Amino acid sequence: MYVKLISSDGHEFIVKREHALTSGTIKAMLSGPGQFAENETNEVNFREIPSHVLSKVCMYFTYKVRYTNSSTEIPEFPIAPEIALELLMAANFLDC
């Protein structure tokens, strides 16, 4: 199952649900009620987080799922200084 995450600047991000659930904040946005007669969501709107950040946040979700419980040596998750502060903000918000 895929969910749609949408950035402040209107970009759409289509990721696997299980990946997104990495975010406690999103886990609590999806697991609660909504959609007439449905007990979980499939679309989330971010008001603060821009595209260039939310992209990175998804990149992380990917990485997290791939490399959790892996006996493969792990590669470093890269962050460019320019994006660091916003990404920190976003993570803090997203609880992940």
């Binding site: 895929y2 950035s7 402040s8 600047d9 209107g10 970009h11 759409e12 991000f13 289509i14 990721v15 696997k16 990946h19 821009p50 595209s51 260039h52 950040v53 992209s55 998804c58 990149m59 992380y60 979700f61 990917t62 990485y63 791939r66 490399y67 590669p75 998750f77 890269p78 200084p81 320019e82 994006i83 660091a84 502060l85 916003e86």
Partner: protein
């Protein structure tokens, strides 16, 4: 042997994985299941070069070392609509503010 992909058209961006071995056609089948458009209405690119349904992602140049989870490789998408052979357009991401002096 896996590759990690961003499939991107306009203000859409799909985060998925596929086998290095698996085919450009098979990828369009994944895209069908998400967006609801058949393979014959798609057209996938690596940069500006169009891909071939037969070739493997590995042959198009998507590899373990150049499509990593933390740095996925970007697959261009364009939608045909009968004779509407639309152009490849990827709405870029927003820009970050300039690096505060304390981080230089």
């Amino acid at each position: 042997m896996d590759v990690f992909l961003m499939i991107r058209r306009h203000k859409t961006t799909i985060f998925t994985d596929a086998k290095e071995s698996s085919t450009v056609f098979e990828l369009k089948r994944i895209v069908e299941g998400i967006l609801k458009r058949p393979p014959d209405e798609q057209r996938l690119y690596k940069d500006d070069q169009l891909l071939d349904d037969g070739k493997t992602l590995g042959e198009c140049g998507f590899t373990s070392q150049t499509a990593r989870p933390q740095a996925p490789a970007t697959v261009g998408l364009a939608f045909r609509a009968d004779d509407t052979f639309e152009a490849l357009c990827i709405e870029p991401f927003s820009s970050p503010p300039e690096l505060p002096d304390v981080m230089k």
